[PDB]
Amino acid sequence: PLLAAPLAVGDTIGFFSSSAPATVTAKNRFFRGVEFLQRKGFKLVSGKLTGKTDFYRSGTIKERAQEFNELVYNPDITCIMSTIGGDNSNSLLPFLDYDAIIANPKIIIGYSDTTALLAGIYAKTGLITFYGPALIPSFGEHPPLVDITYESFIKILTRKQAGIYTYTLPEKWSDESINWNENKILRPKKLYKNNCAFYGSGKVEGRVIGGNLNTLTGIWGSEWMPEIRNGDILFIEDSRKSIATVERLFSMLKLNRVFDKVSAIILGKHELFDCAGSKRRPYEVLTEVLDGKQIPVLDGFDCSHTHPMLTLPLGVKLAIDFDNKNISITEQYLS
Amino acid sequence: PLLAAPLAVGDTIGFFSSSAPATVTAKNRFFRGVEFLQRKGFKLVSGKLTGKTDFYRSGTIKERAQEFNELVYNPDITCIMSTIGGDNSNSLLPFLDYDAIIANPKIIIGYSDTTALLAGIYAKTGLITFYGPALIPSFGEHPPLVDITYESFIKILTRKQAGIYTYTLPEKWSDESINWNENKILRPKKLYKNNCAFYGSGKVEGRVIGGNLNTLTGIWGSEWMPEIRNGDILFIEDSRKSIATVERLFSMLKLNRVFDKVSAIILGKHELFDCAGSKRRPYEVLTEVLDGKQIPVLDGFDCSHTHPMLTLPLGVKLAIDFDNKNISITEQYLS
Ligand SMILES: Nc1ncnc2c1ncn2[C@@H]1O[C@H](COS(=O)(=O)NC(=O)[C@@H](N)CC(=O)O)[C@@H](O)[C@H]1O
Numbered sequence: 067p068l069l070a071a072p073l074a075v076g077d078t079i080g081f082f083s084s085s086a087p088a089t090v091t092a093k094n095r096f097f098r099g100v101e102f103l104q105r106k107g108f109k110l111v112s113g114k115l116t117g118k119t120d121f122y123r124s125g126t127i128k129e130r131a132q133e134f135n136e137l138v139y140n141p142d143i144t145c146i147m148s149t150i151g152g153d154n155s156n157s158l159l160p161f162l163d164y165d166a167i168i169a170n171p172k173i174i175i176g177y178s179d180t181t182a183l184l185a186g187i188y189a190k191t192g193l194i195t196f197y198g199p200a201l202i203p204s205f206g207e208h209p210p211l212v213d214i215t216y217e218s219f220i221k222i223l224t225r226k227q228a229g230i231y232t233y234t235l236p237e238k239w240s241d242e243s244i245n246w247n248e249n250k251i252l253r254p255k256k257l258y259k260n261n262c263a264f265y266g267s268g269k270v271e272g273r274v275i276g277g278n279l280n281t282l283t284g285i286w287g288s289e290w291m292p293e294i295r296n297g298d299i300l301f302i303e304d305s306r307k308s309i310a311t312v313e314r315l316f317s318m319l320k321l322n323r324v325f326d327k328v329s330a331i332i333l334g335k336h337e338l339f340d341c342a343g344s345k346r347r348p349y350e351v352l353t354e355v356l357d358g359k360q361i362p363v364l365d366g367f368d369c370s371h372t373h374p375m376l377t378l379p380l381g382v383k384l385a386i387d388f389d390n391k392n393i394s395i396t397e398q399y400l401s
Numbered sequence: 402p403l404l405a406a407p408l409a410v411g412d413t414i415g416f417f418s419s420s421a422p423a424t425v426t427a428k429n430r431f432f433r434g435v436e437f438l439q440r441k442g443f444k445l446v447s448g449k450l451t452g453k454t455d456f457y458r459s460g461t462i463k464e465r466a467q468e469f470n471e472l473v474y475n476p477d478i479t480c481i482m483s484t485i486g487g488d489n490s491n492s493l494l495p496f497l498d499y500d501a502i503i504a505n506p507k508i509i510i511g512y513s514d515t516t517a518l519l520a521g522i523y524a525k526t527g528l529i530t531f532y533g534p535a536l537i538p539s540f541g542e543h544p545p546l547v548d549i550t551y552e553s554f555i556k557i558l559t560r561k562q563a564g565i566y567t568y569t570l571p572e573k574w575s576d577e578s579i580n581w582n583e584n585k586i587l588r589p590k591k592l593y594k595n596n597c598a599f600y601g602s603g604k605v606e607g608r609v610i611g612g613n614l615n616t617l618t619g620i621w622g623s624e625w626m627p628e629i630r631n632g633d634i635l636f637i638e639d640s641r642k643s644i645a646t647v648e649r650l651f652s653m654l655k656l657n658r659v660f661d662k663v664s665a666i667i668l669g670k671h672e673l674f675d676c677a678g679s680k681r682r683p684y685e686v687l688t689e690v691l692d693g694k695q696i697p698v699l700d701g702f703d704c705s706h707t708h709p710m711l712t713l714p715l716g717v718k719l720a721i722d723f724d725n726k727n728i729s730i731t732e733q734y735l736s
Pocket residue numbers: 086150151152153177178179180203243244246278280281304305337371372
């Protein structure tokens with residue numbers, strides 16, 4: 067695979083808005099995120115669409131593509147980070163400079179709608195990109211949860227590429243929809259004990275592929291959707307969806323013969339899942355869809371829209387030990 | 402293609418609930434729809450899930466497939482009609498009795514989420530299915546608009562298969578979210594003049610393919626998604642979507658090279674489109690996505706979630722005359 071150079075404290079991070087114009091609509095949280103990373107010692111370069119609005123998006127399809135490409139062209143930038151997701155990253159794909167990405171591999175990081183770019187770039191270049199923090203939702207989060215997000219971010223991206231890396235489970239998490247863009251807090255978010263579960267036995271090792279499942283529908287069937295292969299570990303997460311939508315997306319995968327190929331599935335914690343009164347969780351819906359297929363599932367991995375968020379390289383081998391209840395990166399993912 | 406026997410006054414229509422349990426949740430409208438078709442002289446067979454709920458759906462995946470299959474097995478049934486859409490009909494596709502459908506061709510009709518079944522059945526069997534009325538939303542509609550819906554339904558399905566059929570444009574239409582599930586209207590719906598637009602010149606003739614675009618994402622890439630071919634006319638409609646979602650779905654098509662293949666696009670009227678204050682219509686978004694690709698577009702065809710609704714056979718040749726502002730079926734679609 068194509069590998070980017072590791073991050074170092076003091077490096078320059080460039081940020082871009084490939085969909086929702088949250089540098090404007092969530093300006094307070096945006097500034098918190100900027101200040102957070104600056105205090106850590108990072109230099110920040112604002113993408114050219116920072117502070118701009120085109121109603122539901124940051125700008126035209128071509129302007130958003132240009133914003134991203136310009137960060138690729140900047141020789142000082144080691145990490146290109148999404149500001150926030152939305153709905154519209156997939157529009158950029160015909161216009162991204164994939165040859166420039168190959169010529170100067172950088173850490174590309176984000177989540178949610180940005181999956182379209184992460185998966186698309188991987189499909190075209192083989193670059194190992196990262197499912198992880200976006201500037202506004204992830205680093206604009208108040209302490210204490212932002213600190214755990216940052217610890218994963220910095221650990222994954224700066225560590226020496228010697229031996230496997232085994233994730234540490236966050237002790238507590240939240241998906242509560244408070245303290246978004248308000249300047250100060252009335253109270254901290256409700257914290258829940260980590261209910262991450264390992265359904266299965268033995269050890270499974272395979273290339274991890276996926277991201278935000280709903281977002282993947284926007285690139286599905288195209289040359290920008292990376293082929294899922296025999297032995298892959300499927301990583302999928304969604305946010306604020308109805309159980310109806312979750313069934314639809316799981317069945318889409320079934321129809322595409324995805325469950326005949328995967329060695330394991332990782333379900334990210336689903337932010338504010340709406341079970342429509344059924345009290346059913348996404349795993350139960352998956353079980354029905356699977357129709358008896360014995361695929362081991364890591365249910366509730368902290369790499370999703372919930373806080374805190376771990377950083378995950380996409381397109382490299384992971385090992386999930388279902389007996390010992392841990393997950394590791396086993397393949398080099400930075401140069 | 403495989404053709405069903407034509408409909409006739411006095412025939413038996415069977416209905417099924419492949420997703421939302423609206424025979425319960427919209428029971429008043431359901432009863433009005435039943436009464437409407439009965440007064441027209443049709444005999445009705447209730448699918449086995451009528452009157453049942455499993456929270457967000459009518460039953461399990463297998464229960465819903467069974468309900469549909471049992472209608473196919475009934476020799477008395479000429480038309481199999483959706484009660485309503487939802488989100489979840491794509492789940493049924495591995496479990497439908499395609500051999501029985503081939504052996505016993507019937508008129509399969511519905512819209513919205515039911516697109517998954519209409520397109521899926523066509524892909525597997527070559528049967529010409531119909532984008533058209535669902536029992537509850539379409540025939541439970543209060544007068545005056547329900548009569549125009551019915552006129553199209555009965556005309557398309559009972560007419561002699563001799564010569565081309567040219568559609569009549571409804572004089573007025575509405576998309577207002579009122580008068581849903583009560584005995585009486587709150588007040589009359591706003592009746593809009595028909596603003597259907599023909600962008601382009603000359604005549605385009607080709608096989609029509611598509612349906613509800615958001616629903617198509619649930620079968621996309623699979624063996625149940627009919628292959629789009631050079632010269633096809635793409636028919637797409639969506640309902641109650643944000644402009645953000647519409648851009649995403651249009652770009653999905655772009656990435657899949659659909660706009661390199663199709664000779665024309667039909668956009669169904671979009672029910673309660675949310676432009677996010679931009680004042681932009683879906684056609685404007687399509688134009689940006691097309692990036693200079695000249696494809697003639699019929700913008701605002703009355704075959705969608707808006708009232709009244711026309712009946713359209715899928716998988717047969719249509720001719721759109723952009724000069725004379727009309728649309729015709731040019732290929733036999735029933736026995
Ligand atoms: N006003 C608000 N109040 C509270 N939280 C908010 C908020 N606005 C945003 N957030 C939070 O910001 C986070 C990131 O949003 S996102 O735009 O990146 N999401 C996506 O792209 C995919 N969901 C699209 C898909 O499902 O395909 C989410 O967890 C929200 O809860």
